[PDB]
PDB file of C-alpha atoms in Angstrom:
ATOM      1  CA  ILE K   1       0.050  -0.013   0.168  1.00 17.85           C
ATOM      2  CA  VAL K   2       2.504   2.474   0.838  1.00 18.72           C
ATOM      3  CA  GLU K   3       4.444   2.548  -2.466  1.00 19.71           C
ATOM      4  CA  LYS K   4       0.953   2.761  -4.407  1.00 20.11           C
ATOM      5  CA  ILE K   5       0.198   6.402  -2.532  1.00 25.42           C
ATOM      6  CA  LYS K   6       3.603   7.442  -2.104  1.00 26.63           C
ATOM      7  CA  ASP K   7       2.121  10.716  -4.309  1.00 26.54           C
ATOM      8  CA  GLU K   8       0.314  11.851  -6.501  1.00 23.83           C
ATOM      9  CA  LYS K   9       1.958   9.879  -9.903  1.00 23.63           C
ATOM     10  CA  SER K  10       2.067   6.626  -7.968  1.00 23.65           C
ATOM     11  CA  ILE K  11      -1.753   6.450  -7.012  1.00 19.59           C
ATOM     12  CA  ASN K  12      -2.879   7.263 -10.843  1.00 18.30           C
ATOM     13  CA  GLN K  13      -1.174   4.253 -11.410  1.00 15.88           C
ATOM     14  CA  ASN K  14      -2.863   2.477  -8.534  1.00 16.04           C
ATOM     15  CA  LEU K  15      -5.799   3.574  -9.561  1.00 14.86           C
ATOM     16  CA  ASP K  16      -8.479   0.493  -9.466  1.00 14.48           C
ATOM     17  CA  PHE K  17      -6.166  -1.076  -6.973  1.00 13.41           C
ATOM     18  CA  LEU K  18      -6.859   1.169  -4.582  1.00 16.88           C
ATOM     19  CA  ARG K  19     -10.070   1.913  -5.115  1.00 20.66           C
ATOM     20  CA  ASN K  20     -11.664  -0.913  -3.645  1.00 23.18           C
ATOM     21  CA  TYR K  21      -8.553  -1.553  -0.974  1.00 27.24           C
ATOM     22  CA  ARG K  22      -9.906  -2.940   2.712  1.00 26.18           C
ATOM     23  CA  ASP K  23      -7.382  -4.571   4.597  1.00 26.63           C
ATOM     24  CA  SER K  24      -7.633  -6.575   7.406  1.00 25.77           C
ATOM     25  CA  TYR K  25      -9.160  -3.854   9.858  1.00 25.05           C
ATOM     26  CA  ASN K  26     -11.252  -2.773   7.419  1.00 28.02           C
ATOM     27  CA  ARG K  27      -9.278   0.088   6.402  1.00 28.42           C
ATOM     28  CA  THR K  28      -9.387   2.231   2.957  1.00 27.17           C
ATOM     29  CA  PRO K  29      -6.203   3.546   1.915  1.00 29.65           C
ATOM     30  CA  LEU K  30      -7.167   6.927   2.759  1.00 31.96           C
ATOM     31  CA  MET K  31      -7.455   5.758   6.457  1.00 33.26           C
ATOM     32  CA  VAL K  32      -3.763   3.866   5.711  1.00 35.51           C
ATOM     33  CA  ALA K  33      -2.557   7.320   4.723  1.00 35.62           C
ATOM     34  CA  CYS K  34      -3.701   9.241   7.571  1.00 35.67           C
ATOM     35  CA  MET K  35      -1.693   7.315  10.268  1.00 32.88           C
ATOM     36  CA  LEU K  36       0.918   7.440   8.670  1.00 31.35           C
ATOM     37  CA  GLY K  37       0.570  10.523   8.229  1.00 29.47           C
ATOM     38  CA  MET K  38       0.858  11.091   4.460  1.00 32.08           C
ATOM     39  CA  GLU K  39       0.331  14.408   4.487  1.00 32.76           C
ATOM     40  CA  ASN K  40       1.244  14.417   0.449  1.00 33.32           C
ATOM     41  CA  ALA K  41      -1.452  11.474  -0.220  1.00 36.99           C
ATOM     42  CA  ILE K  42      -5.356  13.358   1.884  1.00 36.32           C
ATOM     43  CA  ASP K  43      -6.200  15.482  -1.270  1.00 36.45           C
ATOM     44  CA  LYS K  44      -6.090  13.250  -4.479  1.00 34.34           C
ATOM     45  CA  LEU K  45      -6.872  10.375  -1.931  1.00 32.90           C
ATOM     46  CA  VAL K  46     -10.044  12.618  -1.423  1.00 37.35           C
ATOM     47  CA  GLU K  47     -10.406  13.142  -4.379  1.00 37.05           C
ATOM     48  CA  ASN K  48     -10.273   9.757  -6.512  1.00 39.24           C
ATOM     49  CA  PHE K  49     -12.572   7.881  -3.780  1.00 41.28           C
ATOM     50  CA  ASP K  50     -14.251  10.146  -1.231  1.00 37.22           C
ATOM     51  CA  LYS K  51     -15.489   7.581   1.673  1.00 31.96           C
ATOM     52  CA  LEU K  52     -14.646  10.360   4.026  1.00 32.88           C
ATOM     53  CA  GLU K  53     -16.854   8.540   6.258  1.00 32.87           C
ATOM     54  CA  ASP K  54     -16.462   4.709   5.925  1.00 32.22           C
ATOM     55  CA  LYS K  55     -15.475   2.922   9.446  1.00 29.43           C
ATOM     56  CA  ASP K  56     -12.825   0.885  10.297  1.00 30.16           C
ATOM     57  CA  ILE K  57     -13.757  -2.753  12.369  1.00 29.78           C
ATOM     58  CA  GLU K  58     -13.910  -0.365  15.306  1.00 32.15           C
ATOM     59  CA  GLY K  59     -15.582   1.969  13.615  1.00 31.59           C
ATOM     60  CA  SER K  60     -13.264   4.898  13.559  1.00 30.82           C
ATOM     61  CA  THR K  61     -13.161   7.188  10.131  1.00 32.58           C
ATOM     62  CA  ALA K  62     -10.121   8.622   9.016  1.00 34.03           C
ATOM     63  CA  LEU K  63     -10.637  11.242  10.478  1.00 35.24           C
ATOM     64  CA  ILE K  64     -10.384   9.475  13.929  1.00 36.76           C
ATOM     65  CA  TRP K  65      -7.804   7.425  12.685  1.00 37.65           C
ATOM     66  CA  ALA K  66      -5.565  10.831  12.034  1.00 33.96           C
ATOM     67  CA  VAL K  67      -6.584  12.543  15.570  1.00 33.15           C
ATOM     68  CA  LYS K  68      -5.343   8.973  17.972  1.00 32.70           C
ATOM     69  CA  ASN K  69      -2.271   9.528  15.896  1.00 32.86           C
ATOM     70  CA  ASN K  70      -2.069  13.559  16.738  1.00 31.78           C
ATOM     71  CA  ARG K  71      -1.473  14.748  12.379  1.00 32.83           C
ATOM     72  CA  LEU K  72      -2.794  17.909  12.864  1.00 34.15           C
ATOM     73  CA  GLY K  73      -1.407  18.182   9.102  1.00 34.92           C
ATOM     74  CA  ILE K  74      -3.781  15.411   8.129  1.00 36.75           C
ATOM     75  CA  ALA K  75      -6.678  16.681   9.884  1.00 34.16           C
ATOM     76  CA  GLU K  76      -6.195  20.108   8.906  1.00 32.53           C
ATOM     77  CA  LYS K  77      -6.977  18.477   5.468  1.00 34.30           C
ATOM     78  CA  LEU K  78      -9.304  16.239   6.234  1.00 36.19           C
ATOM     79  CA  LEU K  79     -11.197  18.912   7.546  1.00 36.53           C
ATOM     80  CA  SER K  80     -11.236  21.208   4.394  1.00 33.85           C
ATOM     81  CA  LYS K  81     -12.018  17.680   2.444  1.00 32.15           C
ATOM     82  CA  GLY K  82     -15.557  17.543   4.452  1.00 31.53           C
ATOM     83  CA  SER K  83     -14.643  15.209   7.260  1.00 32.18           C
ATOM     84  CA  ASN K  84     -17.485  14.981   9.954  1.00 30.46           C
ATOM     85  CA  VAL K  85     -15.322  16.144  13.117  1.00 28.81           C
ATOM     86  CA  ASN K  86     -18.516  14.228  15.287  1.00 29.37           C
ATOM     87  CA  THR K  87     -18.120  11.268  13.923  1.00 28.74           C
ATOM     88  CA  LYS K  88     -18.419   8.525  16.668  1.00 29.11           C
ATOM     89  CA  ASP K  89     -16.793   5.340  16.430  1.00 25.87           C
ATOM     90  CA  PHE K  90     -18.785   2.454  17.937  1.00 25.07           C
ATOM     91  CA  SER K  91     -17.667   3.262  21.542  1.00 22.28           C
ATOM     92  CA  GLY K  92     -19.741   6.592  20.625  1.00 23.18           C
ATOM     93  CA  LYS K  93     -16.461   7.924  21.231  1.00 21.98           C
ATOM     94  CA  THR K  94     -15.693  11.504  19.173  1.00 22.51           C
ATOM     95  CA  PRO K  95     -12.517  12.861  17.940  1.00 24.19           C
ATOM     96  CA  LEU K  96     -12.665  15.220  20.764  1.00 24.46           C
ATOM     97  CA  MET K  97     -12.860  12.563  23.009  1.00 24.33           C
ATOM     98  CA  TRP K  98     -10.107  11.023  21.849  1.00 22.16           C
ATOM     99  CA  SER K  99      -7.886  14.007  22.054  1.00 20.78           C
ATOM    100  CA  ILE K 100      -8.887  14.284  25.223  1.00 19.48           C
ATOM    101  CA  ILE K 101      -7.869  11.269  26.350  1.00 18.97           C
ATOM    102  CA  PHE K 102      -4.494  11.584  24.660  1.00 21.45           C
ATOM    103  CA  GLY K 103      -4.014  14.758  25.495  1.00 21.73           C
ATOM    104  CA  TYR K 104      -3.133  16.190  22.129  1.00 21.63           C
ATOM    105  CA  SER K 105      -4.127  19.726  23.414  1.00 21.42           C
ATOM    106  CA  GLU K 106      -3.277  21.663  19.973  1.00 25.01           C
ATOM    107  CA  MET K 107      -5.298  19.137  18.092  1.00 27.32           C
ATOM    108  CA  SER K 108      -8.539  19.410  21.007  1.00 25.89           C
ATOM    109  CA  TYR K 109      -8.094  23.156  20.039  1.00 26.93           C
ATOM    110  CA  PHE K 110      -8.314  22.989  16.572  1.00 26.76           C
ATOM    111  CA  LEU K 111     -11.610  20.305  16.810  1.00 29.01           C
ATOM    112  CA  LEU K 112     -13.236  22.823  18.480  1.00 31.29           C
ATOM    113  CA  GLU K 113     -12.453  25.583  16.929  1.00 28.19           C
ATOM    114  CA  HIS K 114     -13.546  23.832  13.825  1.00 24.27           C
ATOM    115  CA  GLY K 115     -16.881  22.622  14.994  1.00 23.82           C
ATOM    116  CA  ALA K 116     -16.133  20.042  17.625  1.00 24.77           C
ATOM    117  CA  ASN K 117     -19.587  19.479  19.433  1.00 25.40           C
ATOM    118  CA  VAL K 118     -18.779  20.355  23.941  1.00 25.35           C
ATOM    119  CA  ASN K 119     -21.799  18.071  24.775  1.00 27.35           C
ATOM    120  CA  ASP K 120     -22.008  15.128  22.772  1.00 32.68           C
ATOM    121  CA  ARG K 121     -22.483  12.088  24.647  1.00 32.01           C
ATOM    122  CA  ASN K 122     -20.181   8.414  24.504  1.00 34.78           C
ATOM    123  CA  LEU K 123     -21.987   4.929  25.198  1.00 34.38           C
ATOM    124  CA  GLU K 124     -21.361   5.792  28.894  1.00 35.14           C
ATOM    125  CA  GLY K 125     -22.559   9.370  29.116  1.00 31.47           C
ATOM    126  CA  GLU K 126     -19.667  10.772  29.394  1.00 28.20           C
ATOM    127  CA  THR K 127     -19.217  14.472  28.125  1.00 27.98           C
ATOM    128  CA  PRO K 128     -16.056  16.077  26.745  1.00 26.02           C
ATOM    129  CA  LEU K 129     -16.792  18.324  29.808  1.00 28.48           C
ATOM    130  CA  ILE K 130     -16.363  14.609  32.092  1.00 26.40           C
ATOM    131  CA  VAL K 131     -13.823  13.356  29.771  1.00 29.09           C
ATOM    132  CA  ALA K 132     -11.372  15.732  30.575  1.00 30.49           C
ATOM    133  CA  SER K 133     -12.039  16.053  34.491  1.00 27.70           C
ATOM    134  CA  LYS K 134     -11.417  12.349  34.547  1.00 27.56           C
ATOM    135  CA  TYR K 135      -8.356  12.895  32.385  1.00 29.22           C
ATOM    136  CA  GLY K 136      -6.957  16.120  34.625  1.00 27.87           C
ATOM    137  CA  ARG K 137      -7.340  17.911  31.185  1.00 29.40           C
ATOM    138  CA  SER K 138      -7.296  21.686  33.394  1.00 29.71           C
ATOM    139  CA  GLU K 139      -6.744  23.554  30.350  1.00 25.96           C
ATOM    140  CA  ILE K 140      -9.208  21.711  27.907  1.00 24.06           C
ATOM    141  CA  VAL K 141     -11.807  21.857  31.610  1.00 23.17           C
ATOM    142  CA  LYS K 142     -11.092  25.864  31.319  1.00 22.03           C
ATOM    143  CA  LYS K 143     -11.736  25.967  27.424  1.00 24.61           C
ATOM    144  CA  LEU K 144     -15.054  23.456  27.531  1.00 28.93           C
ATOM    145  CA  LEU K 145     -16.607  25.640  30.689  1.00 28.38           C
ATOM    146  CA  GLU K 146     -15.888  29.028  28.068  1.00 27.22           C
ATOM    147  CA  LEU K 147     -17.630  27.246  25.180  1.00 27.55           C
ATOM    148  CA  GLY K 148     -20.878  26.595  27.475  1.00 24.40           C
ATOM    149  CA  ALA K 149     -20.345  22.743  28.118  1.00 23.34           C
ATOM    150  CA  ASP K 150     -22.991  21.415  30.663  1.00 23.67           C
ATOM    151  CA  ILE K 151     -21.486  21.796  34.685  1.00 23.63           C
ATOM    152  CA  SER K 152     -24.597  19.318  35.835  1.00 22.16           C
ATOM    153  CA  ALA K 153     -24.601  16.419  33.283  1.00 22.05           C
ATOM    154  CA  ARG K 154     -23.965  13.587  34.413  1.00 19.88           C
ATOM    155  CA  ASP K 155     -22.612   9.824  33.489  1.00 21.08           C
ATOM    156  CA  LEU K 156     -23.436   6.424  33.987  1.00 22.51           C
ATOM    157  CA  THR K 157     -21.522   7.239  37.344  1.00 20.48           C
ATOM    158  CA  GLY K 158     -24.151   9.623  38.676  1.00 21.91           C
ATOM    159  CA  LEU K 159     -21.355  11.722  39.250  1.00 22.49           C
ATOM    160  CA  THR K 160     -21.064  14.883  37.182  1.00 23.70           C
ATOM    161  CA  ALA K 161     -18.076  15.850  35.997  1.00 26.78           C
ATOM    162  CA  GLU K 162     -16.067  18.235  38.632  1.00 24.02           C
ATOM    163  CA  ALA K 163     -17.567  15.163  41.194  1.00 24.62           C
ATOM    164  CA  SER K 164     -15.608  12.757  39.180  1.00 25.27           C
ATOM    165  CA  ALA K 165     -12.618  15.492  38.684  1.00 24.57           C
ATOM    166  CA  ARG K 166     -12.533  14.371  42.829  1.00 25.41           C
ATOM    167  CA  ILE K 167     -12.246  11.261  42.822  1.00 26.65           C
ATOM    168  CA  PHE K 168      -9.525  10.683  40.741  1.00 27.56           C
ATOM    169  CA  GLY K 169      -8.066  13.420  42.515  1.00 26.34           C
ATOM    170  CA  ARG K 170      -7.205  16.088  39.925  1.00 27.40           C
ATOM    171  CA  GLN K 171      -6.431  19.515  41.741  1.00 27.80           C
ATOM    172  CA  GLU K 172      -6.315  21.500  38.763  1.00 25.54           C
ATOM    173  CA  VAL K 173      -8.916  20.691  37.250  1.00 24.08           C
ATOM    174  CA  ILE K 174     -11.138  21.323  41.080  1.00 21.86           C
ATOM    175  CA  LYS K 175      -9.433  24.859  40.771  1.00 23.93           C
ATOM    176  CA  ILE K 176     -10.780  26.021  37.250  1.00 25.97           C
ATOM    177  CA  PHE K 177     -13.966  24.983  38.927  1.00 24.77           C
ATOM    178  CA  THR K 178     -14.045  26.691  42.060  1.00 24.67           C
ATOM    179  CA  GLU K 179     -13.083  29.894  39.927  1.00 24.29           C
ATOM    180  CA  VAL K 180     -15.968  29.175  37.527  1.00 25.15           C
ATOM    181  CA  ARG K 181     -18.370  28.625  40.430  1.00 24.56           C
ATOM    182  CA  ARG K 182     -16.708  31.508  42.346  1.00 27.09           C
ATOM    183  CA  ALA K 183     -16.808  34.456  39.183  1.00 29.22           C
TER     184      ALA K 183
END
């Protein structure tokens, strides 16, 4: 696959092969390029084969592959081609969720500035605010509150984001909640 998607020229001589290629994860060439950070291949793969919202065996689109591998250049190119920033994998996690889980700060801000939903929920009812609180992403908590995230939301555990921050000992996050509550 790599040699076939190494450049526009390679892509054009392997069109038939690439058009219906799927690997063991049911991934398209586009998803593979996204994982590998082959920024040069993205636009031509999209223009030729589309499939922006096709999902692999975990329910991940190409944008999920880019985000979980912190490929900011790729994610930028996908959003300008029309990728859905609020896609969900089969666990109900969105790109913003993944960026919070892995602590990819720049990616998180980019996703939020490109329409990532601040209130979406995964299957266990966690919102981005709850996930950022549990993972101790204190600047992301601050940003989500600034963007109007619902502080009152509760997940499967019945706890709010702030209560979850206390359970997980996230002092800076707790400090953000306190500053917010005061002001």
